[PDB]
Design a protein around this ligand. Structure first.
Ligand SMILES: *[C@@H]1O[C@H](CO)[C@@H](O[C@@H]2O[C@H](CO)[C@@H](O)[C@H](O)[C@H]2NC(C)=O)[C@H](O)[C@H]1NC(C)=O
Ligand SMILES: *[C@@H]1O[C@H](CO)[C@@H](O[C@@H]2O[C@H](CO)[C@@H](O)[C@H](O)[C@H]2NC(C)=O)[C@H](O)[C@H]1NC(C)=O
Ligand SMILES: *[C@@H]1O[C@H](CO)[C@@H](O[C@@H]2O[C@H](CO)[C@@H](O)[C@H](O)[C@H]2NC(C)=O)[C@H](O)[C@H]1NC(C)=O
Ligand SMILES: *[C@@H]1O[C@H](CO)[C@@H](O)[C@H](O)[C@H]1NC(C)=O
Ligand SMILES: *[C@@H]1O[C@H](CO)[C@@H](O)[C@H](O)[C@H]1NC(C)=O
Ligand SMILES: *[C@@H]1O[C@H](CO)[C@@H](O)[C@H](O)[C@H]1NC(C)=O
Ligand SMILES: [Mg+2]
Length: 596
């Protein structure tokens, strides 16, 4: 009993390599009964009933010998390196198993056609995340007790077999992420009336969801993402009394959201993004359990209904790239833990809801390419959770809230192409995580504050087309990660600093159309990744440094300055000419004579 089982366990272990020594309890000082060995569970008569070797890093062929344990009912080899292929014989003796978990291993080759006959008592079968190939055997329809089947993430091909509809005990059917031929969802899956989980994402499915699936009245999670299903989202999903998740992202669904979607009180997550839906968001929403609503990249029209505010656990709202209109519900966010809000590329208007970050969890506020107007609320100035703000291409105006500039987790601050006014405050010093500052095409004024040069991670400062004045702060020149500096079309004055070697990552320097003066520093030419240099329309004077000829410039523009001497010889050709026009004192040396 303990004798027999210890020996069979040890036999099984001998056919495996165990480089992490996960099974050291099995062969160390024989004495401890096997019942207390790692991964081993016994019944009251001390017979092994369950072997669970999950995540033990074991290598080698399937350990068929474990099946010789007379009371073994559960075997898990989840997340190891069991390798080679499965044979008919591997499972000859495994007929007492109820639970078999071979997920996340290295198995290759076909599923044996004999598997159901050798494992007739199985309730749970998982072989997800391997490299299995060939078709799912039609023999699978012979299982009399199977409750859950997971073959997701293999290379299974052919088409999903119709005989699976015979397995009427199934509650979970997971086939996602295989290499099936393009085909419809088999009609016969409608016969699996107990199903709670149907996961056929990335299955090369075409055609409509079959009308027979309306018989799946117990569905909790329907996930058909990543296919080319067509026609309408059927209205019977709305009558599911226990539905929690509907995932239909990246299909070819057309028509409209069923009107009665509003009464799906149990729904937690709804995604129908990346389809061809038209019509409006259903109104009279009573989505009391909703956590996530994604409907981006469709052709939805009309407003976000006020009733979305009844969803007091809503955290994710992604509606971008539709034709949505009107003002947002003024209370949006006041009573929801909003974390990710992306309403970009629509036609929304009116003010940004003032309590969008009311519960202090908002991380992404993405509103690009709408017609939002008025001011950013001072409330937003205190939203310390914000990491990514994109408010560009709206009709916003006024001063930015003071603390907005120094929020401690803010990474991307994009405000471009609005009508914002004011100076950038010195409290920007607080924005320790700032990577990208994108503020071009506004009416900001004053001097660029010195403290921007303390923000060591900054990779982009983009501030073109404003009213900035004063000097370029010496501090910018020691931002070691700065990639893009664009301050074109302002009223900046003074000089460029001489010592620029701190700009080891600068790719673009654009300072065109300001009132800058002095000489172009020699060290511009020693910058190792500069490919864009625009200093046009300023008052730079003196000679063009010969070191510029080290650079490979996509853009070089020195036009409309007060430069003197000769053009560097590398640029003497007539094709480069427009790069230097409008410098009265400058000439080009060609054929033994200097020419304007
Ligand atoms: C698969 O198994 C390995 C252990 O063999 C797991 O890797 C360990 O996971 C924890 C993280 O929770 C780390 O502290 C260990 O350092 C990891 N070890 C190694 C070798 O990487 C891995 O988490 C398991 N995978 C799953 C999905 O559970
Ligand atoms: C299972 O298939 C995968 C995915 O094709 C193989 O994983 C690697 O695939 C990448 C590129 O697709 C290659 O650079 C490697 O050669 C593959 N990994 C290796 C050789 O370890 C994977 O090899 C397959 N596994 C088995 C056991 O055949
Ligand atoms: C170099 O920069 C100057 C501006 O400093 C460019 O000239 C402007 O070009 C636009 C056309 O897109 C006109 O609207 C402006 O009126 C021009 N400014 C002046 C002062 O004439 C010029 O095109 C750039 N040259 C190259 C080769 O890129
Ligand atoms: C199983 O993996 C080991 C070690 O990585 C290898 O030496 C052995 O030949 C593998 N077996 C098969 C059939 O690939
Ligand atoms: C199994 O399913 C096939 C295909 O739907 C069907 O024709 C066959 O009669 C079914 N057999 C059993 C035993 O249910
Ligand atoms: C959309 O799904 C298809 C499979 O139908 C996939 O090949 C494609 O890359 C996916 N695209 C996106 C953006 O998810
Ligand atoms: Mg910008």
């Amino acid at each position: 009993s303990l004798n027999q089982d210890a020996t069979i366990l040890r036999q099984a272990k001998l056919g495996l390599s165990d480089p992490a020594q996960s099974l050291s309890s099995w062969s160390d000082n024989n004495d401890v009964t096997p019942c207390k060995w790692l991964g081993v569970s016994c019944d009251a008569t001390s017979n092994v009933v369950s072997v669970d070797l999950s995540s033990f890093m074991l290598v080698g062929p399937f350990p068929s010998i474990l099946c010789h344990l007379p009371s073994l009912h559960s075997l898990s080899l989840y997340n190891n390196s069991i390798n080679g292929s499965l044979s008919a014989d591997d499972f000859d003796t495994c007929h007492n198993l109820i639970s078999l978990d071979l997920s996340e291993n290295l198995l290759v080759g076909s599923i044996p056609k004999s598997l159901p006959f050798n494992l007739p008592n199985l309730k749970f079968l998982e072989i997800s995340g391997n490299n299995l190939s060939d078709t799912i055997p039609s023999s699978f329809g012979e299982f009399r007790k199977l409750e859950s089947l997971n073959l997701a993430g293999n290379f299974l091909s052919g088409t999903i077999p119709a005989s699976l509809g015979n397995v009427t005990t199934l509650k979970e059917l997971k086939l996602a992420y295989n290499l099936f031929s393009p085909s419809q969802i088999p009609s016969q899956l409608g016969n699996l009336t107990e199903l709670q989980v149907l996961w056929l994402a990335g299955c090369n499915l075409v055609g409509p969801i079959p009308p027979s699936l309306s018989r799946l009245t117990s569905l909790v999670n329907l996930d058909l993402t990543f296919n080319q299903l067509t026609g309408s989202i059927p209205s019977w999903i709305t009558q599911l009394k226990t539905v929690e998740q509907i995932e239909l992202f990246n299909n070819s669904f057309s028509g409209e959201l069923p009107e009665s979607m509003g009464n799906m009180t149990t729904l937690k997550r709804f995604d129908a993004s990346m389809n061809k839906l038209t019509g409006k968001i259903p109104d009279n929403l009573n989505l009391l359990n909703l956590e996530s609503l994604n409907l981006f990249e469709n052709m939805l029209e009309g407003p976000l209904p006020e009733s979305i505010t009844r969803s007091k656990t809503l955290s994710e709202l992604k509606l971008f790239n539709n034709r949505l209109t009107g003002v947002l519900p003024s209370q949006l966010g006041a009573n929801s833990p909003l974390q990710y809000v992306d309403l970009s590329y629509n036609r929304f208007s009116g003010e940004i809801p003032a309590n969008v970050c009311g519960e202090g969890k908002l991380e992404y506020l993405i509103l690009i390419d709408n017609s939002f107007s008025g001011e950013i609320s001072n409330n937003l100035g205190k939203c310390k959770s914000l990491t990514r703000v994109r408010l560009s291409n709206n009709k916003l105006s006024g001063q930015i809230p003071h603390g907005f500039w120094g929020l401690p987790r803010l990474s991307l601050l994009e405000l471009s192409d609005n009508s914002f006014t004011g100076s950038i405050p010195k409290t920007i010093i607080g924005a320790k995580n700032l990577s990208n500052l994108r503020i071009s095409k506004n009416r900001f004024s004053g001097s660029i504050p010195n403290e921007i040069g303390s923000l060591n991670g900054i990779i982009e400062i983009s501030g073109a087309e404003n009213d900035f004045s004063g000097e370029i702060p010496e501090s910018l020149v020691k931002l070691k990660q700065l990639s893009r500096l664009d301050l074109s079309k302002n009223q900046l004055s003074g000089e460029i600093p001489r010592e620029l070697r701190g700009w080891k990552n600068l790719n673009e320097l654009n300072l065109a159309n300001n009132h800058l003066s002095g000489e172009i520093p020699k060290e511009v030419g020693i910058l190792p990744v500069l490919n864009y240099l625009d200093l046009s329309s300023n008052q730079f004077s003196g000679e063009i440094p010969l070191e510029l000829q080290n650079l490979k410039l996509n853009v070089l523009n020195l036009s409309y300055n007060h430069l003197s001497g000769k053009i560097p010889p590398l640029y003497a050709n007539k094709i480069y000419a427009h790069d230097f026009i409008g410098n009265p004192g400058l000439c080009v040396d060609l054929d033994g004579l200097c020419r304007k």
